[PDB]
Amino acid sequence: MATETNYPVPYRSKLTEPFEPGQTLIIKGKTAEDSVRFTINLHNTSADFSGNDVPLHISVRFDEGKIVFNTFSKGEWGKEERKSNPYKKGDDIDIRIRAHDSKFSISVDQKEVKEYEHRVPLSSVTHFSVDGDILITYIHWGGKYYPVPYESGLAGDGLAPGKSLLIFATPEKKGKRFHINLLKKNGDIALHFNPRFDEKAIVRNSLISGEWGNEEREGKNPLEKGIGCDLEFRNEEYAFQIYVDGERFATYAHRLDPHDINGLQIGGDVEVTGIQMV
Numbered sequence: 001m002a003t004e005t006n007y008p009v010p011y012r013s014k015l016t017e018p019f020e021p022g023q024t025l026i027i028k029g030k031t032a033e034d035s036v037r038f039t040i041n042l043h044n045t046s047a048d049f050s051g052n053d054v055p056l057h058i059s060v061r062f063d064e065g066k067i068v069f070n071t072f073s074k075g076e077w078g079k080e081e082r083k084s085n086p087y088k089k090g091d092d093i094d095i096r097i098r099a100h101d102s103k104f105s106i107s108v109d110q111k112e113v114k115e116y117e118h119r120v121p122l123s124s125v126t127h128f129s130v131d132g133d134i135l136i137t138y139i140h141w142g143g144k145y146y147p148v149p150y151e152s153g154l155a156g157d158g159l160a161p162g163k164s165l166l167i168f169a170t171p172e173k174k175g176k177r178f179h180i181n182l183l184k185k186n187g188d189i190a191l192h193f194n195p196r197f198d199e200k201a202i203v204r205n206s207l208i209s210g211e212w213g214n215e216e217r218e219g220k221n222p223l224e225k226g227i228g229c230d231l232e233f234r235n236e237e238y239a240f241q242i243y244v245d246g247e248r249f250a251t252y253a254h255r256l257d258p259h260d261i262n263g264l265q266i267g268g269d270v271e272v273t274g275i276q277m278v
């Protein structure tokens with residue numbers, strides 16, 4: 001409540017379309033040394049009536065030191081389900097809710113902590129709200145089930161200079177390695193991002209005319225098996241700026257002319273939950 005910026009609470013948003021299996025709602029924010037609690041709700045209602053069903057209610061309690069989940073329907077609350085609250089008053093929070101056909105999978109700090117079985121129709125979720133002692137800094141709802149190996153084209157402009165490709169993924173618990181390729185029309189790979197847990201390093205290289213280049217590694221692998229990560233590839237003037245979980249992990253000098261990077265491939269031991277061009 002010190003600064004504004006955006007996402008002022010009480011925050012409310014009407015979904016373009018009902019929440020569907022494979023989609024994720026991401027909520028990030030800051031709390032104060034005096035914060036007591038805040039809530040995240042997936043609710044029904046018409047358009048602004050407010051008071052209908054609440055398929056999923058999440059209460060983050062600093063007083064009780066617990067994260068509590070419940071559902072409200074037909075004018076009554078069900079039995080609450082609890083998990084420990086890993087957060088201390090102050091410091092940032094990162095809560096993500098992914099819908100599936102039988103439950104919601106909730107992660108805290110990119111670690112899965114709760115599987116909440118649906119008690120009422122997921123399709124009943126038409127809005128979501130966030131309120132309480134929290135300063136919201138980021139909110140996003142989208143994604144789908146991305147099959148892996150994955151391959152797709154990038155818009156018309158592609159990963160052009162000044163743009164960034166954002167990928168939300170989770171390295172498999174017992175996976176060994178995975179990769180992300182940013183390609184050009186002819187198949188050359190401008191940037192090959194290859195985390196190798198068996199080698200404790202992320203390999204970066206380019207594939208030009210069927211041949212692999214030098215290879216840039218080292219920098220201590222910031223990823224961890226089973227934990228979600230936010231990968232951002234920023235196309236800048238002289239090089240790609242690779243961010244991992246909000247921190248610049250490395251830079252990669254362009255070996256191929258930037259511009260026209262209109263292809264994407266993802267493979268290996270990884271689960272993809274979101275891809276956006278920002």
Ligand SMILES: OC[C@H]1O[C@@H](O[C@H]2[C@H](O)[C@@H](O)[C@H](O)O[C@@H]2CO)[C@H](O)[C@@H](O)[C@H]1O
Binds near residue numbers: 214215
């Ligand atoms: O260095 C990136 C590059 O690795 C190639 O595999 C390398 C391997 O990393 C290296 O240890 C070995 O000595 O040579 C291999 C190539 O013959 C991958 O094939 C290539 O796709 C890039 O990922």
